[PDB]
Amino acid sequence: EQGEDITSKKDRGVLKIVKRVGNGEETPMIGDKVYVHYKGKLSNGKKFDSSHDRNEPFVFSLGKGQVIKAWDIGVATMKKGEIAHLLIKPEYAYGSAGSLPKIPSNATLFFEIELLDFKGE
Template identity: 40%
Template sequence: MPEELQTIETKFLKKMADRTTSQQQEESKKGAGILIRTIKEGSGKPPKKGDICEVHYEGFLEDGRQFDSSRERNQSLQLRLGEGHVMEGWEVALLHMKVGQLAEVTIPHLYGYGEQGYPPKIPPRSTLVYQLEIIRIEGRK
């Protein structure tokens, strides 16, 4: 293989490895097995505890069955982060997101509805998959 092609191939492989590493870091830095996969990038800074976030969401069981959607109701949700008003998995995810970002968030049962679930819609020990989008962030006044 000519030296020029080897250089191009090496650069390409390095770029792909860097991209994969970056994605793995984004997913794993959330800790606790909560995975965040960005579908659409956002802008600005992530919220902080005490900030109010306005979000749209769709919730699914691991098998793909939908159990809730703010979009279908055409009614976003407003919540103050850090006050325990939503499941821990949401708190972790939202603290790593930006306005306009749409992400698929996978939440293990320990950070969702726990051992008991939320019958009849959510069985015990269910891993949940949400599509979360931050519409607006309002800082604490």
């Protein structure tokens, strides 16, 4: 329950720590194509997911809600080369409905994210 509160409502739903600083000043804009590696888990550590388990960069369009809200918020704060940890309350992840079978109701999630690169499509 440590980290910078990076939510808009300042409700501590998404807590962020920079583990490795990136390069430059620039962070990605909404609509940028983003390339990451990540490892992620449920706080109840019975499900761990990883891009490394394919060794393939995970790619998505930032701010489009193609991923959980906490990602769109979180990756937008990141500099290229940055590694960050996000602790995520259910309101910014899968909420009260969850996403069975992977995600139970009201789950807290953790991710380690490396931002590799972003480009304007």
